[PDB]
Amino acid sequence: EVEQLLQFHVATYMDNDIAGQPQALQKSGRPVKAIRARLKGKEGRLRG
């Protein structure tokens, strides 16, 4: 359980859009802005 907690924290530190699982959340209810979410899209690093 605890090693899997480490695995999940490390995974969602990099990619919080993994299919078929909950998202690392903020206590405000929003999901964590992972690095991948930082890099992609119209508003991401590359295009924005």
Next chain:
DNA sequence: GGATTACACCCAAGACACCAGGCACGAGACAGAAAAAAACAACGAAAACGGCCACCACCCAAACACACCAAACACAAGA
């Protein structure tokens, strides 16, 4: 099963976690597991009764013969 769905600009409005069961420590009880003893198997030692060879006599087995019966070539009959 995911992933993408125009471009630029302006303004306003609300929030920027609170509260509840788990870790540590905090103490009991049968279960996770450890110690023991008494009725479980065997073997050593004595007792006398069941087992083996005699002795023995009456009942079943073999020989002799009887009459009786089953049976087998063939002289005769027959198609």
